[PDB]
Design a protein around this ligand. Structure first.
Ligand SMILES: *C(=O)[C@H](CCSC)NC=O
Ligand SMILES: [Mg+2]
Ligand SMILES: [Mg+2]
Ligand SMILES: [Mg+2]
Ligand SMILES: [Mg+2]
Ligand SMILES: [Mg+2]
Ligand SMILES: [Mg+2]
Ligand SMILES: [Mg+2]
Ligand SMILES: [Mg+2]
Ligand SMILES: [Mg+2]
Ligand SMILES: [Mg+2]
Ligand SMILES: [Mg+2]
Ligand SMILES: [Mg+2]
Ligand SMILES: [Mg+2]
Ligand SMILES: [Mg+2]
Ligand SMILES: [Mg+2]
Ligand SMILES: [Mg+2]
Lengths: 116, 177, 136, 50, 75, 66, 77
RNA sequence: CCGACUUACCAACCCGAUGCAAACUGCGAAUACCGGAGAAUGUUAUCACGGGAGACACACGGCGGGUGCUAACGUCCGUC
RNA sequence: UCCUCCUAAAGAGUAACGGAGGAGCACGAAGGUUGGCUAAUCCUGGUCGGACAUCAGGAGGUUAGUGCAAUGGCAUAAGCCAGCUUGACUGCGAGCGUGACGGCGCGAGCAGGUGCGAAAGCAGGUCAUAGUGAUCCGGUGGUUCUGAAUGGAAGGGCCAUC
RNA sequence: UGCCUGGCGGCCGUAGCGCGGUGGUCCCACCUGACCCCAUGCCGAACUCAGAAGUGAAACGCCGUAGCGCCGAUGGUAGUGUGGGGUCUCCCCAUGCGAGAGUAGGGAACUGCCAGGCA
RNA sequence: CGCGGGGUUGAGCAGCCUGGUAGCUCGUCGGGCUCAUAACCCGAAGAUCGUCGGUUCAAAUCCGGCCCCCGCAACCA
C-alpha cells in the first residue's frame, strides 16, 4: 500500500527514540496540510501541538501545504513550546523524506531556539 | 495527446451510458503500457541484448531496462543475475502516443492481418499481445536490424473485469473480431 | 511386507512401550480386532495374519490395517563381541498397546467375520479380542 | 593458507604498522587506508608494505 | 626465476637441455621407485601377525619428497 | 526523464498513400509516407475476397466446350 | 557403525539471573544463541546477543510486543 | 496433420477421516533449580584463609535411559 | 584438536568402539553508516518460449534468503540494492559468565582522533556458535631502559611482529 | 458534553479475514499539472514540488452479518512428588499437584492525550 | 557392503596431467588391382568420453553420489 508502507519506514527511528527516552517532535504531512506535535517520552500524551488546521496559523497563509506553510507552522511549534520549558527534542521524520516542506518545517523550528 | 482528448471527451460518456455507472471515476481507464522481450539467446552473446535494447529504444521513446533472471534453472542453463530480458514502461503522454501510433498504423502493417484476438484478456481487465515482427514499426527500416525478434505489448488498465476491458478497448476502435 | 520408504534416520532408540492406546475405535468398517495385551508386533506377523483372514472370507469384503511398523530394529550378528557400534537393522515392528484396533473388515456377516479374526488372532503374539462398531 | 599476511606501514614517518591479511591474487594493489597513528596521535595514510 | 650460465647461446641451449631432461628423467625415476616402495605398504599394512613388518619402510617413501616440476614458459 | 539517456523525440508529419496526413511524435528524424492507415485498411471490405481461395468444378465446365 | 562419536564442549547457555534477582551494572542476565529474549528497558545486547544489565536493579521478564516476544527489562531501584 | 475418439491403468498437490517419531512442536505438567520475605529447629551445620592427608580399580538395589536380545551377578551415564 | 543436534531425565553439567553432520577457511568489501525494497510456490493472458527464462494481474504470505554443517534467530529485518567511507582505531575499563589451572568470552562508560547523518545517534569487524597450538631458541622494525674502569659498541630489556 | 475526522500510544486476534450496506461542510483518499526543489539502474507509477477542477469508484473509516480464524470452561482421562504393594520388560493403593485433545459456550473489541468541523 | 584399480568407437589402448583440437592399431563398408580369394591401394561411417548432479563463459578432464567389472582382506592360543 502507501500508508502502511510509510508507517513501516518509521518504526526503526521511532523505536530508538523510545529506548533513548527522549522527547520527540513528530510530523504528519498531507498534500493539503502539515501537522507537528511535541510528544512526551511515554509516547502517549502530547505537550504542544500546532498545525495548519488551526485558524490562527492558516488565516495568515496564501495556501496551507507549500514550503512556506511548513515554515509558518515550524515557527509556531517552537514559539509555543519555548514558554513551556521544552527546548531539547529530537526530530521525527515519521516516514517522510527529509527533503521538502518537512525540511523547511524543521529548519524554521530549529531557527527559533529549539535544539535538535 | 489526441487519444487522451478523445478518451476524456467521448469514451467517458459512452462507457457511463453503456454500463450505468454512478461516479465519473468508476469508468475503466488504461493506466500503463509495457513493452518487453526476453531475448533468451543472450547467454552466449551479450551484444544481442544491447541490440534488443536499441530496438526497443527505437520502438518507444525511452531506454529499456535490462531485466535479469529471478532464479536459476537448469532447463535452459541460466543462473541468477544473468541479463535475459528488456522492458519498457509507459505512463501518461508517451503511453497515449504509443497507443495511437500502434493502433492507427502499426497494426495494419503486420503481414497477413485478420484481427487481434478478443479472448486474450487475463480475466481482470488487462490485455496482452505479441507482435512477432519488430519491423512493422516505422521506427525500424528493415536495414539496421538482423532478426525478426518480437515484442510483447501489455495494456494494464483500471478495468475491474475483462468485459469492461474489452468495452474500453473497443471504444478506441481496437481491431477485434 | 510393510515397511516405510525413505525414512529420515536409519536407526531408532529402543524406547519403552508404556501407556494405553489411541486408535481404540473402529471407524472405517464394522467389525474389528482389538488388542488386549502389549508388545511389539513385527511386519511379518502383520502379513501372515492378513493372508489368513483375506482368505477366510474367500476374497469378498474390504479389510483395513490400522497399524504400520515404521520402527527399525537392529540385531547384532552371531559371534560378534559387544561394542564397536550399533547393530544392523533387520526388521520393522509396530508397537501395540492395550486398546489398539489392529485390523477391521466390512461387507461380511458377523459370524463369518468373527470366525475370520479367530484365524488371524492365532498368528499374532499378543492377546486380541473382537469388537464391533458403535455410534459413540 | 591462500590468504597471505601483509602489513600496513604508516606514512607519518614513524615506525608503527598495522598487520592484516590480503588475497594475493585478485590484483596486486597497495592498500590505502586511513588509520590512527598513536605515535603522532592523528589519522594518517597507511600504505601497505612488508 | 633467472638462472645464469656461461656460454654464447649454444652452451646455454645445451646446458638447459641436459639439465631439464635430466630433471624430467630423475623425477620420473623417483616417482617410479615411490610407486614400487609403496608395494608392501599398500599391499599388507594390516591383518595377521606380519602387521608391523611394513612400517619399517613407510619412512623411506617420504624420505624422498619428489621434486615438483614447473611448466616451461615456452609453449 | 533522466537528462539525455533516451533517444531523441521530435514531432513528425507522416502521410498515407491516399493522404490522411497525421502528426505523430516519434523518433525517426525524418517523416515517412506509408500504406493505408487504420482508416483505410481493407480488413472490413475485402474479407470475402480474402477467404475466396478455391474452385475447380466450375473451371472444368468452361473447359467443357461440348 | 563407526565414523561417529564426535561432539563439542557445552557452551553453558541459559538464563543466569531470574526474575527478582538484584543485579549490579554490567552483569550478564542471559546467554542466548540467537535472540530468544529481546533486550527491553535498561538492558543491552552483546555481539553474542548476550543481554546484560546497564543499570543496577531488579530483573523483570515480560512478553510485550506485537508478536509476543519475551523482553527482559530492569526495575532500577 | 492436430490427437481427431478411448483405457479393465499409475496418479503428485488439495478436501474428509486414522495412526507413528531421540535428532517433529500452532500445546504442556509433576518435580528440580534460582531469588525475596517470615517464624520454628539445628552443640555454625555456611563461607574465607593456613598445617596434614588419603583417594582418582568401585559393587548391588530402586527410579529415568543408551548398548545388548527391554538376555546376563553384562557394559556406560543421571539421582537416592 | 575444534563446531552443531539427540542420548541429557523442562536451570548448568553429564558417559560408551552410542545415533547424524561439519572446520583447519572467506571478505578491502561479503565491514561502518545513510536512504530505499521485500520472498518461495502456484493460477489466467502473452512471438519464437518448452514442464519451469522475460512481461502484466491475482492467491499466498516467509514454506524464500542467510559466503559454508546444524541449532537458535531475523520484517525495526541479521535478507536485497545504491551514495559516501575506513570504528577491521590507539590507551583503558565498572561489573559479570565459564574453566583445577594455563586461559577464554560479554561488556556500559572515560580520554585522544575519525566515518556516515540535517539530527537524535550508530560504529572497537561480519546474524551467533568452528576456521586452531603454550614455552624455549632465534629473525625484522622501533625505543639510550641497561651498557662488567670511563665514552661508545656487542649483547640483553620493553613495544609491534614472523 | 455528543457525533464524525487526523496524529501518537496502551493492548496485543474475544482485537484478524471474508460477505453486505454506508460517509465527503471540515478531515482523509484518490486527482490536475510538472519547466522548477527532488526521481526512476526505464517510467513523477514510488519519492518530491506547484495546486485545486472532479469523485467517494479504489483505499480508508463506521455499522451489520458466524461462514473461517481466535478465546474456551465443568467433569473425566494421561502424567507425576512422597510413602506402601504386585502375578514387579508394566501396573495397583494412600495422598498432593493435575494437563493435551475434545464438548457446552464466548466472540465480530476496549482505552488514554492533543488538534479540527458540526450540534 | 571393508580396502585399492578401471569404464572412451566392434576388440585392445592414448587423450585426465592442470578445461579452449575425440585419437591410434586391428576391425566394418563401398570402389580399384586379379581368372578369383587373400595381401595391397583409394575413400568413408560411428563414441551421451559408464549413468546422475555441482562449480565453471566453457568439462572426457575438476568435485561429489550411483552402477558394473578386476584383485585383496576378514588374525593368533
Ligand atoms: C596356547 O595356549 C599354547 C600354550 C599352552 S601352555 C598351557 N601354545 C602356545 O604357543
Ligand atoms: Mg587413574
Ligand atoms: Mg575410574
Ligand atoms: Mg561408576
Ligand atoms: Mg513410586
Ligand atoms: Mg556390574
Ligand atoms: Mg539440560
Ligand atoms: Mg534436569
Ligand atoms: Mg557427574
Ligand atoms: Mg554480511
Ligand atoms: Mg536501514
Ligand atoms: Mg549488513
Ligand atoms: Mg555466519
Ligand atoms: Mg663500559
Ligand atoms: Mg670493558
Ligand atoms: Mg635491541
Ligand atoms: Mg480446547
Amino acid at each position: 500500500d502507501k500508508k502502511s508502507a510509510r508507517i513501516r519506514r518509521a518504526t526503526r527511528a521511532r523505536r530508538k527514540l523510545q529506548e533513548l527516552g527522549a522527547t520527540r517532535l513528530v510530523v504528519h504531512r498531507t498534500p493539503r496540510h502539515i501537522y507537528a506535535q511535541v510528544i512526551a517520552p511515554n509516547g502517549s500524551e502530547v505537550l504542544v501541538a500546532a498545525s495548519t488546521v488551526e485558524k490562527a496559523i492558516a488565516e495568515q497563509l496564501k495556501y496551507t501545504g507549500n514550503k512556506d506553510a511548513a515554515a509558518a507552522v515550524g515557527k509556531a511549534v517552537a514559539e509555543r513550546a519555548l514558554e513551556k520549558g521544552i527546548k531539547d527534542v529530537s526530530f521525527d521524520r515519521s516516514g517522510f523524506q527529509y527533503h521538502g516542506r518537512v525540511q523547511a518545517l524543521a529548519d524554521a523550528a530549529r531557527e527559533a531556539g529549539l535544539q535538535f | 495527446a489526441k487519444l487522451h482528448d478523445y478518451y476524456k471527451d467521448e469514451v467517458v460518456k459512452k462507457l457511463m451510458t453503456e454500463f450505468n455507472y454512478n461516479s465519473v471515476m468508476q469508468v475503466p481507464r488504461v493506466e500503463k503500457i509495457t513493452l518487453n522481450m526476453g531475448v533468451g539467446e543472450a547467454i552466449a552473446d551479450k551484444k544481442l541484448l544491447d541490440n534488443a535494447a536499441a530496438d526497443l529504444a527505437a520502438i518507444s521513446g525511452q531506454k529499456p531496462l535490462i531485466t535479469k533472471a529471478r532464479k536459476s534453472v537448469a532447463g535452459f542453463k541460466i543462473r541468477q543475475g544473468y541479463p535475459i530480458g528488456c522492458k519498457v514502461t509507459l505512463r501518461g503522454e508517451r503511453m497515449w502516443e504509443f497507443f495511437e501510433r500502434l493502433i492507427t498504423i502499426a497494426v495494419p502493417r503486420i503481414r497477413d492481418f485478420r484481427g487481434l484476438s478478443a479472448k486474450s484478456f487475463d480475466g481482470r481487465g488487462n490485455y496482452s499481445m505479441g507482435v512477432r515482427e519488430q519491423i512493422i514499426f516505422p521506427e525500424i527500416d528493415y536495414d539496421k536490424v538482423d532478426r525478426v525478434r518480437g515484442l510483447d505489448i501489455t495494456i494494464t488498465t483500471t478495468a475491474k473485469s475483462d468485459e469492461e476491458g474489452r468495452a474500453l478497448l473497443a471504444a478506441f476502435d481496437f481491431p477485434f473480431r | 511386507m510393510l515397511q516405510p520408504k525413505r525414512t529420515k534416520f536409519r536407526k531408532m532408540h529402543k524406547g519403552r512401550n508404556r501407556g494405553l492406546a489411541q486408535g481404540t475405535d473402529v471407524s472405517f468398517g464394522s467389525f474389528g480386532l482389538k488388542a488386549v495385551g502389549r508388545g511389539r508386533l513385527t511386519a511379518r506377523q502383520i502379513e501372515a495374519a492378513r493372508r489368513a483372514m483375506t482368505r477366510a472370507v474367500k476374497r469378498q469384503g474390504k479389510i483395513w490395517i490400522r497399524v504400520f511398523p515404521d520402527k527399525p530394529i537392529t540385531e547384532k550378528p552371531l559371534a560378534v563381541r559387544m561394542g564397536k557400534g550399533k547393530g544392523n537393522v533387520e526388521y520393522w515392528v509396530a508397537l501395540i498397546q492395550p486398546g489398539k484396533v489392529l485390523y477391521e473388515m466390512d461387507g461380511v456377516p458377523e459370524e463369518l467375520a468373527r470366525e475370520a479374526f479367530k484365524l488371524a488372532a492365532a498368528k499374532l503374539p499378543i492377546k486380541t479380542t473382537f469388537v464391533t462398531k458403535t455410534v459413540m | 593458507g591462500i590468504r597471505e599476511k601483509i602489513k600496513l606501514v604508516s606514512s607519518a614517518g614513524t615506525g608503527h604498522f598495522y598487520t592484516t591479511t590480503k588475497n594475493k591474487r585478485t590484483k596486486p594493489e597497495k592498500l590505502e587506508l586511513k588509520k590512527f597513528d598513536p605515535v603522532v596521535r592523528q589519522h594518517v595514510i597507511y600504505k601497505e608494505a612488508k | 626465476e633467472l638462472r645464469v650460465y656461461p656460454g654464447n647461446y649454444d652452451e646455454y641451449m645445451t646446458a638447459a637441455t641436459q639439465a631439464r631432461e635430466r630433471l624430467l628423467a630423475d623425477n620420473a625415476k623417483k616417482k617410479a621407485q615411490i610407486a614400487e616402495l609403496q608395494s608392501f605398504v599398500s599391499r599388507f599394512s594390516a591383518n595377521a601377525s606380519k602387521s608391523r613388518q611394513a612400517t619399517s619402510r613407510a619412512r623411506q617413501i617420504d624420505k624422498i619428497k619428489l621434486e615438483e616440476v614447473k611448466a616451461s614458459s615456452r609453449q | 526523464m533522466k537528462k539525455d539517456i533516451h533517444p531523441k523525440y521530435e514531432e513528425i508529419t507522416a502521410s498515407c498513400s491516399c493522404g490522411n496526413v497525421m502528426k505523430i511524435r516519434s523518433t525517426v528524424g525524418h517523416d515517412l509516407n506509408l500504406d493505408v492507415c487504420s482508416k483505410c485498411h481493407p480488413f472490413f471490405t475485402g474479407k470475402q475476397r480474402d477467404v475466396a481461395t478455391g474452385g475447380r468444378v466450375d473451371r472444368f465446365n468452361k473447359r467443357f466446350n461440348i | 557403525s563407526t565414523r561417529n562419536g564426535r561432539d563439542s564442549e557445552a557452551k553453558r547457555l541459559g538464563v543466569k539471573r531470574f526474575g527478582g534477582e538484584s543485579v549490579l551494572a554490567g552483569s550478564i542476565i542471559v546467554r542466548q544463541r540467537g535472540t530468544k529474549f529481546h533486550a527491553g528497558a535498561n538492558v543491552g545486547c552483546g555481539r553474542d546477543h548476550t543481554l546484560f544489565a546497564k543499570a543496577d536493579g531488579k530483573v523483570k521478564f515480560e512478553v510485550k510486543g506485537p508478536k509476543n516476544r519475551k523482553f527482559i527489562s530492569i526495575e532500577a531501584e
